[PDB]
Short mmCIF file of C-alpha atoms and ligand atoms in Angstrom, two decimals:
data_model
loop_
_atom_site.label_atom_id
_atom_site.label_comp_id
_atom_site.label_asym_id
_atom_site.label_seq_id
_atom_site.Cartn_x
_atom_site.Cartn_y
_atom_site.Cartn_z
CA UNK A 29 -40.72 35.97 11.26
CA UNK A 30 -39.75 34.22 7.96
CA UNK A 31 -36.91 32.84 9.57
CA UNK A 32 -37.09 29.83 12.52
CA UNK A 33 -34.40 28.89 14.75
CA UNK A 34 -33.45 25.32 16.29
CA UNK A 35 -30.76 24.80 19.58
CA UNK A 36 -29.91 21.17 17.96
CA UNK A 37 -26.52 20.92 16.37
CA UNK A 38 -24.92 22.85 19.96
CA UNK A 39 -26.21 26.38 18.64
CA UNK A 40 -29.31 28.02 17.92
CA UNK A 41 -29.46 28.02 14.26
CA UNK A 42 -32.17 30.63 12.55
CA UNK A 43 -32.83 29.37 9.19
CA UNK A 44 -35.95 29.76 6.70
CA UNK A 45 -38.72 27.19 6.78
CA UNK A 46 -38.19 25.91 3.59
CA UNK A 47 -35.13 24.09 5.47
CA UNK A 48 -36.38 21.60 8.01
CA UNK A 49 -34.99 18.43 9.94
CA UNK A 50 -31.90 19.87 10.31
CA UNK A 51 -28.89 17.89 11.32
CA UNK A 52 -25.48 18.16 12.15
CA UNK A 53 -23.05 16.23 10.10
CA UNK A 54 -19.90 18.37 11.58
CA UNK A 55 -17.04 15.15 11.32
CA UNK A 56 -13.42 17.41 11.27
CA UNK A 57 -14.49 20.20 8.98
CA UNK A 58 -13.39 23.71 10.11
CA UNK A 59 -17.16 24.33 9.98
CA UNK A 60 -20.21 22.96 12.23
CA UNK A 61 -22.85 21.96 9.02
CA UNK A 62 -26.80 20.67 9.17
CA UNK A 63 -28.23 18.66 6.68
CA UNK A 64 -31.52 20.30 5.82
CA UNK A 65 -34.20 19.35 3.42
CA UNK A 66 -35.71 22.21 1.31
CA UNK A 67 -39.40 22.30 0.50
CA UNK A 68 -39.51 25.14 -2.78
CA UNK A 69 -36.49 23.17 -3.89
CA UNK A 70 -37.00 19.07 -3.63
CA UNK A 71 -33.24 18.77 -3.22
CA UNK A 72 -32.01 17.82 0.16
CA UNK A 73 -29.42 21.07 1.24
CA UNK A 74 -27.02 20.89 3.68
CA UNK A 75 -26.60 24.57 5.62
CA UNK A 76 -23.57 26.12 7.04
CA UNK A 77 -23.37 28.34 9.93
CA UNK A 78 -20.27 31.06 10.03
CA UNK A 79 -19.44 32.06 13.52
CA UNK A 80 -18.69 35.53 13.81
CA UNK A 81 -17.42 36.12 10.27
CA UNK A 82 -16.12 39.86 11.48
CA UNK A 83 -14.70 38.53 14.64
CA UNK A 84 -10.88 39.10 13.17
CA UNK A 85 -8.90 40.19 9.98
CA UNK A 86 -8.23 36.42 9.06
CA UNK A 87 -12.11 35.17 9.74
CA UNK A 88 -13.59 38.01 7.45
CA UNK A 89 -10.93 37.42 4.54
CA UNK A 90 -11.18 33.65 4.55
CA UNK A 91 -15.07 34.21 4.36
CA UNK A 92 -15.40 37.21 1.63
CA UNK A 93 -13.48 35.13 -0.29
CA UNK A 94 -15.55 31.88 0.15
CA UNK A 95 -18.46 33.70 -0.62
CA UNK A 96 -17.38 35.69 -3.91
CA UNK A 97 -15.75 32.75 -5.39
CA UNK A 98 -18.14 30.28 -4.69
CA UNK A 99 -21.14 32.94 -6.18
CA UNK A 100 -18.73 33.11 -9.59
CA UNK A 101 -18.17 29.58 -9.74
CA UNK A 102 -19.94 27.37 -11.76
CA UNK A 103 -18.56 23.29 -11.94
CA UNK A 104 -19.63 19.71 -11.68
CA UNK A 105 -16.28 19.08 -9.55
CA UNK A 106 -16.43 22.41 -7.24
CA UNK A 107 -18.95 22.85 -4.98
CA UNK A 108 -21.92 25.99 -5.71
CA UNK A 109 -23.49 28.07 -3.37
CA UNK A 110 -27.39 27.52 -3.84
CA UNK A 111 -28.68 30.55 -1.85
CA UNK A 112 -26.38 33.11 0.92
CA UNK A 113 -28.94 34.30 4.03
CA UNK A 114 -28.50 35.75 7.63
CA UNK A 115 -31.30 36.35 10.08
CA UNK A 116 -30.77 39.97 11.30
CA UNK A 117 -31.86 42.78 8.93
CA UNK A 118 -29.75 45.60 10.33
CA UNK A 119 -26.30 46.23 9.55
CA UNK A 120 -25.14 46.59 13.01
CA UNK A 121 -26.35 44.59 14.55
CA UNK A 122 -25.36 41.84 12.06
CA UNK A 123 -23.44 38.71 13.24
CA UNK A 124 -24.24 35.69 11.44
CA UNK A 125 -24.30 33.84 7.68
CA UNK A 126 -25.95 30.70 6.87
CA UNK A 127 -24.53 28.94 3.65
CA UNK A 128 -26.49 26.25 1.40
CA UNK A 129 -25.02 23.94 -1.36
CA UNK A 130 -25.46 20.65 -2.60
CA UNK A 131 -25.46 18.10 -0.53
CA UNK A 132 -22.80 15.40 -0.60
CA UNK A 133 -23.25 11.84 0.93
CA UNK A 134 -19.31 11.84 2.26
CA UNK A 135 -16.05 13.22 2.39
CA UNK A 136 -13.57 11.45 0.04
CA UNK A 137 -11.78 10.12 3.10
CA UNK A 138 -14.94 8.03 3.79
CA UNK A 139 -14.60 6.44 0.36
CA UNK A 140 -10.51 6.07 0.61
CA UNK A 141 -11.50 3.65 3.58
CA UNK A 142 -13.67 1.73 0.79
CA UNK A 143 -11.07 0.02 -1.08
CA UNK A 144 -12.78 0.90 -4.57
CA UNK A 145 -11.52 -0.11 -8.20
CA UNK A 146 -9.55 1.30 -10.85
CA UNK A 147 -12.75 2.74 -12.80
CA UNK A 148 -13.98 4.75 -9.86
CA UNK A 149 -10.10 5.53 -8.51
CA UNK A 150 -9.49 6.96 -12.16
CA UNK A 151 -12.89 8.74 -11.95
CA UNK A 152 -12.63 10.50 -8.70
CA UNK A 153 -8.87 11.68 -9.96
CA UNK A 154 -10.02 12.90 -13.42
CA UNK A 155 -13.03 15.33 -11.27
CA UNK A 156 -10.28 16.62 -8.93
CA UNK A 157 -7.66 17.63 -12.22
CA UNK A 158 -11.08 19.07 -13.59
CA UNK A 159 -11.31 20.87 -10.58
CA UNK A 160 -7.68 22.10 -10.58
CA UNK A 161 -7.44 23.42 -13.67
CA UNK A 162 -10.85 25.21 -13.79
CA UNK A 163 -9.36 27.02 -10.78
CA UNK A 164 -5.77 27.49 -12.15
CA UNK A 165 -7.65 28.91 -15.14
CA UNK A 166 -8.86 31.87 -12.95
CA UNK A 167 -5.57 32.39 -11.83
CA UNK A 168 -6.56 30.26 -8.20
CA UNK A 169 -4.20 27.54 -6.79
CA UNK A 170 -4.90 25.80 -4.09
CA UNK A 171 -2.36 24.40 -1.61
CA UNK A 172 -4.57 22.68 0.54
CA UNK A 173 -5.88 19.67 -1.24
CA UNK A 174 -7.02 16.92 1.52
CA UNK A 175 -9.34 14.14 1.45
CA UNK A 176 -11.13 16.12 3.90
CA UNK A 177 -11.71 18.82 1.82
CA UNK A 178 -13.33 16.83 -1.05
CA UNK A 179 -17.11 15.45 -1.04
CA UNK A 180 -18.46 13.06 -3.11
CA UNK A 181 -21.95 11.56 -3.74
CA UNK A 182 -22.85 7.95 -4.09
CA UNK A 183 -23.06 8.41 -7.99
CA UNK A 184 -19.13 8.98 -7.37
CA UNK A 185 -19.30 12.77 -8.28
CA UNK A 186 -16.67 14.45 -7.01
CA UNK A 187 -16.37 18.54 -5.71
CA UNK A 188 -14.38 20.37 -3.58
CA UNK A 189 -15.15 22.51 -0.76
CA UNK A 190 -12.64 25.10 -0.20
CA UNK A 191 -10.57 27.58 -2.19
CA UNK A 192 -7.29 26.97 -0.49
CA UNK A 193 -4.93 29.37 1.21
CA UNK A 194 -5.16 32.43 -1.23
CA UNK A 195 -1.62 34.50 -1.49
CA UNK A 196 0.93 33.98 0.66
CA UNK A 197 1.78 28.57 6.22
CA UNK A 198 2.68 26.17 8.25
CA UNK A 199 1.54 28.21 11.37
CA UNK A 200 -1.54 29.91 10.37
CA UNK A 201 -4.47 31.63 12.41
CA UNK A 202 -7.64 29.55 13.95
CA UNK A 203 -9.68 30.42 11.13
CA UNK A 204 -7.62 28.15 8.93
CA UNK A 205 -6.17 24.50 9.07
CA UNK A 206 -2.51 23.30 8.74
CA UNK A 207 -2.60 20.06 7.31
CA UNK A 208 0.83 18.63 6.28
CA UNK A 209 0.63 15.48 4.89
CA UNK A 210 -0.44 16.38 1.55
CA UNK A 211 2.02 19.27 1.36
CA UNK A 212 4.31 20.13 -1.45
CA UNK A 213 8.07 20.32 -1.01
CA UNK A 214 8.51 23.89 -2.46
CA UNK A 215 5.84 25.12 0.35
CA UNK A 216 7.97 22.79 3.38
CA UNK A 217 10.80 24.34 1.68
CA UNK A 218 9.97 28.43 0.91
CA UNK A 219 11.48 27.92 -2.52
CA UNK A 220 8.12 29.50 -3.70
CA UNK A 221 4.93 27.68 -5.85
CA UNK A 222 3.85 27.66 -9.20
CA UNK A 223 0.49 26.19 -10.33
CA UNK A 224 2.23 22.61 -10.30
CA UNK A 225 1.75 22.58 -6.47
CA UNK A 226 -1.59 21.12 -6.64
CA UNK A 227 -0.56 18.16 -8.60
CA UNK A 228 1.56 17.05 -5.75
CA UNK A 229 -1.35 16.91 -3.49
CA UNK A 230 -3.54 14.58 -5.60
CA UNK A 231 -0.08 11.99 -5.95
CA UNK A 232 -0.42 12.31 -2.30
CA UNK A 233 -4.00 11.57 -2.24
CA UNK A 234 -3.98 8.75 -5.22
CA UNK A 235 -1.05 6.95 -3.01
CA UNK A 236 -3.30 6.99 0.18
CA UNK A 237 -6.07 5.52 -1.86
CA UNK A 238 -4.21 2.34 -3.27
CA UNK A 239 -1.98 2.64 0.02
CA UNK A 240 -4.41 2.93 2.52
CA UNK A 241 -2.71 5.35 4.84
CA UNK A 242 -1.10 8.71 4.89
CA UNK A 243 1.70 8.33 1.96
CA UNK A 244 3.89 11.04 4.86
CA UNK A 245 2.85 10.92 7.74
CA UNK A 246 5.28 13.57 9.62
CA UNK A 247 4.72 14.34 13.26
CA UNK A 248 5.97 17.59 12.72
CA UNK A 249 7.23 20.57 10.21
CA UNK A 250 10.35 19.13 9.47
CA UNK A 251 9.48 15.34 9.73
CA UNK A 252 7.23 15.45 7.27
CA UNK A 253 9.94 16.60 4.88
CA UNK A 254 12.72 14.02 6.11
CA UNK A 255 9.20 11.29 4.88
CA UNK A 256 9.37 12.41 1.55
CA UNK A 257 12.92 12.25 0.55
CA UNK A 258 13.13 9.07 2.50
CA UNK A 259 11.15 6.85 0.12
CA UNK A 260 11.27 9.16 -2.85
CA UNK A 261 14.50 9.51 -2.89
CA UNK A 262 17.09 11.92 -2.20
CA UNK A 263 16.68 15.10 -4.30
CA UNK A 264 19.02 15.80 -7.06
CA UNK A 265 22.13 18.67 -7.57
CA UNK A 266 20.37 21.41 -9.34
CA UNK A 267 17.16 21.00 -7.50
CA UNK A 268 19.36 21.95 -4.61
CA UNK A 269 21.33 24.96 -5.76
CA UNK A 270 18.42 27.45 -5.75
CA UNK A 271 17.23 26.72 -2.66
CA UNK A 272 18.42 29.80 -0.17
CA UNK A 273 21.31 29.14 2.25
CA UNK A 274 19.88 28.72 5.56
CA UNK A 275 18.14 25.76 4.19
CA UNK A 276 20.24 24.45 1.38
CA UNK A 277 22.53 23.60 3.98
CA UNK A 278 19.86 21.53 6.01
CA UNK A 279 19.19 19.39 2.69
CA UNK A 280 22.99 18.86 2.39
CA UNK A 281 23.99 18.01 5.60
CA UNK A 282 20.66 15.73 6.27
CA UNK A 283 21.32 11.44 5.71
CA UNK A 284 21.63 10.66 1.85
CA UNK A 285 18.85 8.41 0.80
CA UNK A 286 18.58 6.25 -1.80
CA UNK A 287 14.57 5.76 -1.75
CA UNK A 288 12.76 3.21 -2.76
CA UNK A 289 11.54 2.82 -6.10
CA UNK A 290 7.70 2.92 -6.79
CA UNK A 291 7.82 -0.69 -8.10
CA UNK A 292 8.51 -1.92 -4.36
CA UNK A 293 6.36 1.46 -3.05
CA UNK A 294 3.41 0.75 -4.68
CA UNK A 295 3.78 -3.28 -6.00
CA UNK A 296 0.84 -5.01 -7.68
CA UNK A 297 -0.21 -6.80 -5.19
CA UNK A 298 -2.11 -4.43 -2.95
CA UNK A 299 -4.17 -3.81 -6.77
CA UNK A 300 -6.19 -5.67 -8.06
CA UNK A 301 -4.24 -8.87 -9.60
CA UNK A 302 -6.93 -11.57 -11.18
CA UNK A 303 -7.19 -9.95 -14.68
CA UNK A 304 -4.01 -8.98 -16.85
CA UNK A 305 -5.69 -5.61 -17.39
CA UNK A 306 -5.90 -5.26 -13.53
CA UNK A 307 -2.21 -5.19 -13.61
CA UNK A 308 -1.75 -3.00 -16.61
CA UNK A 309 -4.01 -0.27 -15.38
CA UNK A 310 -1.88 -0.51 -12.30
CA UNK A 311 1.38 -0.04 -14.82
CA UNK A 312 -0.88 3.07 -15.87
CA UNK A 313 -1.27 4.26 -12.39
CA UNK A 314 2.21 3.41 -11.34
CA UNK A 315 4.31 5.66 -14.05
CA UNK A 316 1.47 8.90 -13.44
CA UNK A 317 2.12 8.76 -9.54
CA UNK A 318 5.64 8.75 -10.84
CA UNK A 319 5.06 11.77 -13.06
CA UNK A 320 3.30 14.04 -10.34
CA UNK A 321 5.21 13.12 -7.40
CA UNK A 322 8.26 14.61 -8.15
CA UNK A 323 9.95 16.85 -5.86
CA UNK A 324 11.34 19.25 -8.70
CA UNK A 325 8.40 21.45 -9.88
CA UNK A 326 9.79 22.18 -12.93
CA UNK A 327 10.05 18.79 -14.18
CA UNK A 328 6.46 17.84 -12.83
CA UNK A 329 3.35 16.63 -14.56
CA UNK A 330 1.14 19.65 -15.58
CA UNK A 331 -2.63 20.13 -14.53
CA UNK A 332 -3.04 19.72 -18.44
CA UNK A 333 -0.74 16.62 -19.25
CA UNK A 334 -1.98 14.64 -16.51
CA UNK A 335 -5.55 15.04 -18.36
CA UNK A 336 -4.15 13.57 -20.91
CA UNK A 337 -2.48 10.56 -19.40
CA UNK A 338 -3.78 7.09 -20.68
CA UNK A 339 -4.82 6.36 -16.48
CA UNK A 340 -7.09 9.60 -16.87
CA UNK A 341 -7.66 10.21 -20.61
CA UNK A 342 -10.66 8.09 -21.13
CA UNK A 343 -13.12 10.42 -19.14
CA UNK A 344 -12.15 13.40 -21.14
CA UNK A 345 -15.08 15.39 -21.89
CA UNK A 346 -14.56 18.95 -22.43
CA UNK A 347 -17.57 20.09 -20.57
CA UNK A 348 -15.87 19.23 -17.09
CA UNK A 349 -12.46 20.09 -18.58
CA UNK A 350 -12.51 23.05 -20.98
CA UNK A 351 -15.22 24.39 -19.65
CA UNK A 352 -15.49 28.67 -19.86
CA UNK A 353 -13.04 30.34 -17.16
CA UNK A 354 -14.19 31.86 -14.02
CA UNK A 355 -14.14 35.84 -13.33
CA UNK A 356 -14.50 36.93 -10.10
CA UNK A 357 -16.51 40.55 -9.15
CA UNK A 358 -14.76 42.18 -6.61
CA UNK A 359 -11.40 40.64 -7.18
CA UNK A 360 -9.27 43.28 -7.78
CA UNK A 361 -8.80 43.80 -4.54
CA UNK A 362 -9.03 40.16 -3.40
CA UNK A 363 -5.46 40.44 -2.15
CA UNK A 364 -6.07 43.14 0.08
CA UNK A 365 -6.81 43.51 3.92
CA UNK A 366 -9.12 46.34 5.26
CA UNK A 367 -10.98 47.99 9.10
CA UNK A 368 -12.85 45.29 10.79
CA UNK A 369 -15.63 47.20 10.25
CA UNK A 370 -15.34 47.58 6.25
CA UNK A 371 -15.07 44.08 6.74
CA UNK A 372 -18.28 43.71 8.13
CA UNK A 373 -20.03 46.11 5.95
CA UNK A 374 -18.73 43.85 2.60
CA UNK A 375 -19.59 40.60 3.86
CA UNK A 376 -23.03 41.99 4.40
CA UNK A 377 -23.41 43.32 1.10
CA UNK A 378 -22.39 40.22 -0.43
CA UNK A 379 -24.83 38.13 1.11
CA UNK A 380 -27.65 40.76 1.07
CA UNK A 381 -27.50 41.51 -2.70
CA UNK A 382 -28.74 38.00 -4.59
C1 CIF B 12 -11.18 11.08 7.42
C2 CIF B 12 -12.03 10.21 8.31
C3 CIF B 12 -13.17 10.93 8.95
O1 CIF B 12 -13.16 11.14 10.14
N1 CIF B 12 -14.16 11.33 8.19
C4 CIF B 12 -15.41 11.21 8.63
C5 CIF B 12 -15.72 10.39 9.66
C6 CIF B 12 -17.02 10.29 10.08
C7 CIF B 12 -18.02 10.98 9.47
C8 CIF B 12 -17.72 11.78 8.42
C9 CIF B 12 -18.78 12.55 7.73
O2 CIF B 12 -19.75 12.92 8.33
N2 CIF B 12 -18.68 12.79 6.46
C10 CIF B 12 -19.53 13.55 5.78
C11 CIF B 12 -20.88 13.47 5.87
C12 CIF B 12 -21.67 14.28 5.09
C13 CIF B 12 -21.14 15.19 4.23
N3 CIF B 12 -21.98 15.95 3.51
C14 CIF B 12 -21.71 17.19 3.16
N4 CIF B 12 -22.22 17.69 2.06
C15 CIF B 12 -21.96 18.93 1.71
C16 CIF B 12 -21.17 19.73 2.49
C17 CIF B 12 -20.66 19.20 3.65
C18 CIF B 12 -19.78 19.96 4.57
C19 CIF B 12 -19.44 21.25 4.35
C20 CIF B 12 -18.60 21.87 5.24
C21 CIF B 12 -18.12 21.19 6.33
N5 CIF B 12 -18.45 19.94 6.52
C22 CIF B 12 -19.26 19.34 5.67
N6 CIF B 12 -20.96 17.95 3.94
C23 CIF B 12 -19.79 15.25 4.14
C24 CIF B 12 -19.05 16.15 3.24
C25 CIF B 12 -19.01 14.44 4.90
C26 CIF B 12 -16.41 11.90 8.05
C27 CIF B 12 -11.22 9.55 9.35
O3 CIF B 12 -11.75 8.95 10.27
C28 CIF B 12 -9.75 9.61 9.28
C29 CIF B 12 -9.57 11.08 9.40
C30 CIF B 12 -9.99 11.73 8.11
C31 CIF B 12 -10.39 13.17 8.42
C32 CIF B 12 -8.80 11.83 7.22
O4 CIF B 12 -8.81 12.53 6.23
O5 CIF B 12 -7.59 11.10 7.55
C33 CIF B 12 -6.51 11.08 6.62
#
């Protein structure tokens, strides 16, 4: 009716006609997405497809929260949901939901492989704090910051796609995605997480930029921790004493590591090197990776001091940064599982009221 359907991009998508040429640019994202241009809006849209949303507890949850937050959200550096539709009219027989944003040219992996410059590095890392912090204002951390999970246009404007892991992970469900690399030590270590998590990711993420490569690459849950204190450096004595006993002991009794020092981790070489200011931007850059990538939380950067820091300070407008605090609808119970069914009826009602 007011809805066609295509088989390309290995499903039969139903989508309005307003969306046409549609494409799939699916490259590792937990979702299959079409590129799409609209005709009421000139924009070109890329459209998501969410395969049986009700199909389990974890599916629904992952999407009702998706949708909610991403209908209260409103920032430069976070993605926005332009319109919510599905196909069928009837409640039962409902099965599908077709999401539209903005789209982005890449993923900010695509642009790590560009070896880019300190303006644009500093750039893309002031967006993501911006990002952060407008979601640590509404009480949201994220725990899953990955290149893969960022987007960025050619214009360098950077957003993010998902709202993390919610409450709680290194053995989740299929709906979600356990990716280690970029992992905090408190999380590979249960000792619990404060907002300061995030910051951890994006030293992770800044490092494989200048780097070129996964900073830890660990083949498996307890390799990747043996990576970190192995070039960072062994942790200290009352970093150690809170940790609970059946894994204190494993940090005890592992090899004692000196670590390298960031000097000889990240030398000025691999920067740029011509101009004296080359080198002193990477003196900038150098001190704030060692400010955030420390493996004792409380003694880590803050979301709000790293906005501060002369590498990030100098794109400080409070419009991306201070910018008025999200409030979610239906959030009062966002930490709180419910009958398949009730699941289905909600994530209908969401999408059909808009
Ligand atoms: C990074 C890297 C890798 O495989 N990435 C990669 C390789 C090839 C192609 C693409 C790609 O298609 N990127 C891409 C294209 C278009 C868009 N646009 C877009 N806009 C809005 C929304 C979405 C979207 C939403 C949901 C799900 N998907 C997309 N897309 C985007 C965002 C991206 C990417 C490697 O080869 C190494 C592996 C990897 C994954 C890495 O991180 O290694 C550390």
């Amino acid at each position: 009716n007011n809805f066609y359907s295509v088989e390309i991009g290995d499903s039969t998508f139903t989508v309005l006609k307003r969306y046409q040429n549609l494409k799939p640019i699916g490259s590792g994202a937990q979702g299959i997405v079409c590129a799409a241009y609209d005709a009421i809006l000139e924009r070109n849209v890329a459209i998501k497809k969410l395969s049986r949303p009700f199909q389990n507890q974890t599916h629904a949850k992952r999407a009702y929260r998706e949708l909610v937050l991403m209908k209260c959200v409103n920032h430069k550096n976070i993605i926005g949901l332009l319109n919510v539709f599905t196909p069928q009219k009837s409640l039962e027989e409902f099965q599908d939901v077709y999401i539209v944003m903005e789209l982005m040219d890449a993923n900010l992996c695509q642009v790590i492989q560009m070896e880019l410059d300190h303006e644009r590095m500093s750039y893309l890392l002031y967006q993501m704090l911006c990002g952060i912090k407008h979601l640590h204002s509404a009480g949201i951390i994220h725990r899953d910051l990955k290149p893969s999970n960022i987007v960025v246009k050619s214009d360098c404007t950077l957003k993010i796609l998902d709202f993390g892991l919610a409450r709680t992970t290194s053995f989740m469900m299929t709906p979600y995605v356990v990716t280690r690399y970029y992992r905090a030590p408190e999380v590979i270590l249960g000792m619990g997480y404060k907002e300061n998590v995030d910051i951890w990711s994006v030293g992770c993420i800044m490092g494989e930029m200048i780097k070129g490569g996964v900073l830890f690459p660990g083949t498996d849950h307890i390799d990747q921790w043996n990576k970190v204190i192995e070039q960072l450096g062994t942790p200290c004595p009352e970093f150690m004493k809170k940790l609970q006993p059946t894994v204190r002991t494993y940090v005890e009794n592992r090899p004692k590591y000196a670590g390298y020092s960031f000097e000889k981790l990240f030398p000025d070489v691999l920067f740029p090197a011509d101009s004296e200011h080359n080198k002193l931007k990477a003196s900038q850059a150098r001190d704030l990776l060692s400010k955030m990538l420390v493996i004792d939380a409380s003694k880590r950067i803050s979301v709000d001091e790293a906005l501060q820091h002369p590498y990030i300070n100098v794109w400080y407008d409070p419009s991306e940064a201070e910018a008025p605090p999200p409030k979610i609808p239906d959030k009062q119970l966002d930490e709180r599982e419910h009958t398949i069914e009730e699941w289905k009826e909600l994530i209908y009602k969401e999408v059909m009221d808009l």
